[PDB]
Amino acid sequence: ATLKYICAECSSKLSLSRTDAVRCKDCGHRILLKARTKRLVQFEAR
Amino acid sequence: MIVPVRCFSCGKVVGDKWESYLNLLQEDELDEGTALSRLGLKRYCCRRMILTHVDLIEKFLRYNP
Amino acid sequence: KVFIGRLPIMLRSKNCYLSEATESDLYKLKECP
Amino acid sequence: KAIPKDQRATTPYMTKYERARILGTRALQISMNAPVFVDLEGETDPLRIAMKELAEKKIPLVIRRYLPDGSFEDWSVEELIVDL
Amino acid sequence: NQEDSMIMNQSSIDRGLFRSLFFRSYMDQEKKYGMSITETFEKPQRTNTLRMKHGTYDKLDDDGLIAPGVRVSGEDVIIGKTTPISSKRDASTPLRSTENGIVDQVLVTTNQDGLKFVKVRVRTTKIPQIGDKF
Amino acid sequence: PSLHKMSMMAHRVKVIPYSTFRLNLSVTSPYNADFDGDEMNLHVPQSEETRAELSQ
Amino acid sequence: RGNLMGKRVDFSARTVISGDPNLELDQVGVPKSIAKTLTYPEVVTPYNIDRLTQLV
Amino acid sequence: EEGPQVKIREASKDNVDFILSNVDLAMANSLRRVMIAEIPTLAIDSVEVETNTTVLADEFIAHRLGLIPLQSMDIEQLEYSRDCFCEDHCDKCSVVLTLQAFGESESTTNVYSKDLVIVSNLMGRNIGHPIIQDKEGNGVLICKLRKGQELKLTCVAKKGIAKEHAKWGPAAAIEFEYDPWNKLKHTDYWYEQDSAKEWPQSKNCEYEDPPNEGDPFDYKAQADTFYMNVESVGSIPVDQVVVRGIDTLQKKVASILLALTQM
RNA sequence: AGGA
Ligand SMILES: Nc1ncnc2c1ncn2[C@@H]1O[C@H](COP(=O)(O)CP(=O)(O)OP(=O)(O)O)[C@@H](O)[C@H]1O
Ligand SMILES: [Mg+2]
Ligand SMILES: [Zn+2]
């Protein structure tokens, strides 16, 4: 449960806080994505 | 980019008819005009759906994440 | 020997990485073939 | 200078611009809760009331028609023909 | 369909005729001001500045960024940022008033320097309507 | 443009659905309007006086 | 010519135009959203008091 | 046997050719319209997304899910949520479907109309089952996944009509024709040299007599005899797109009578 | 850089 950030290439879960270095815990590439809400999204199918 | 379910113009389900249309072309060595017709697509509205589709999904699938 | 500034490279040119890359490589590279 | 009633040489007819300005002025007045000089026969739009006042010729206004020299003829909305 | 206009099959439009995806990337970065004076990517509250946007800050998480699932609408704050002075001034990036949609992709990176760099892609689906050009 | 006395005319409001201004087809010529994506301007008078000017 | 001869103005709206055979020569189709923005300042008078109290 | 007659030319699982006789055009057409527009069906109308790692957008997929034809055989014993007394939905007024798919394989993993599973109670009534007319029994291809590409959705199918959205369209195209020999002059053929040569002859010409040139114009002649073909999508069987059309139109008229009664 |  809970995965704060996702690496843009290797797709490994990161889960970091403010002042914890914007970089992957394996490869380099400082990209990092946000990982969608637990607050679930609903669409009228039209 | 991914086969449309239902013909825009008349609403005939076309979502199932893709995998087969591709087989009738490769496996059965058929021409488009026959393949389409064997799948029941008689009205030109239905024909253009399958005939003029560009299954872009297949390219997008080629990217890692 | 000595560093005299940086030159912007045109994509797909000799000096660019993609010039030598194959379809399969470009896809890995997150670039449209 | 102000031209006398005998000696007035402008149209005996009201101008498209005069009529419009009168209807506007009276509508604006009626709307600002001014007294109405006509029976509103169930009337509620100040412009529609203004048309009724002009029709019954019960509008207490005067047109001051200025001339290029600066002189003028004063005309009552009562006396002005409405062929418009 | 007179004078260069046309009649479209509402039924067809429902079936997916002419629908489009629309994306837009709002971007921002934490700025450093000589004397190690940095900006913060955070969700702000009242706190002496009171200089904040008229729309909801509630869609923001503790990093001052909306999660990549959330439906955004008015001038909803998409990026939360503050600049204090000699305290939380607001530097929060709201969704273009005229627009709306769903947060698509949020990207948290590093500046050429070493500052916190952020890019937010928002996505909407545009359905053929009456004034639309073809 | 607005090269005409008739390139600005007063109309009766008709509140309607959908996002476009709708005009009668015969009124198309004085404006030089067509529906290949033309846009038009609407001006609301704020006085009882200005309204009259427009209607009259 | 920029700020005196011409001016930007309030009580103004602009959208795409489309033709309607069901509109009268003198009317204009005004999108609801536009009507809900453009306002006319009506004075509280005995003739309208009740009507206005309802729109408020 | 009675008033307007019917003569089925060809029947099948999903197509009915028939000749409607002893009717007014205004009635054949009113029936035509109803079959397209006003017969109720069941269709996915709410998609709640839990996960999507796909190349397609949440709403793009959502749109597709609505268009997937569902069993609407017993649609009459289901309520419109509007009419139903619950907060949102329930078993009285909806069918709840589930879709979970993940790319376990190295090869492209497909997502089908079959992969949908009913999680609600169907009160023992023929409804909600995705229509599979497919040869290999798969139905509509919703999506495609690669590896860690996951999909998680909960779908609420509801009773509705085509007038609200075409996804509740019980029928595909409806063939309709009258007077294959233009004896009524309801058309004036555009030609170059000869209208009779340049314009193809209808298959229905065989079921009516040719005009015979040496005859005066029959002005008295009225339009009856309608060559029609109703095609089903799957939700409701062909016969029922015809029957339920007739019943829908009938109720629509009866409402007017009842409206006059309350008056 | 685009729109009538
Ligand atoms: N630069 C410009 N400045 C002012 N008005 C312009 C303009 N360009 C176009 N217009 C206006 O737009 C009108 C339409 O021009 P176009 O969009 O090119 C179609 P058209 O030339 O009228 O031929 P068509 O009606 O047979 O299609 C003009 O008649 C003119 O009033
Ligand atoms: Mg034009
Ligand atoms: Zn990594």
Ligand SMILES: [Zn+2]
């Ligand atoms: Zn079709």
Ligand SMILES: [Zn+2]
């Ligand atoms: Zn219910």
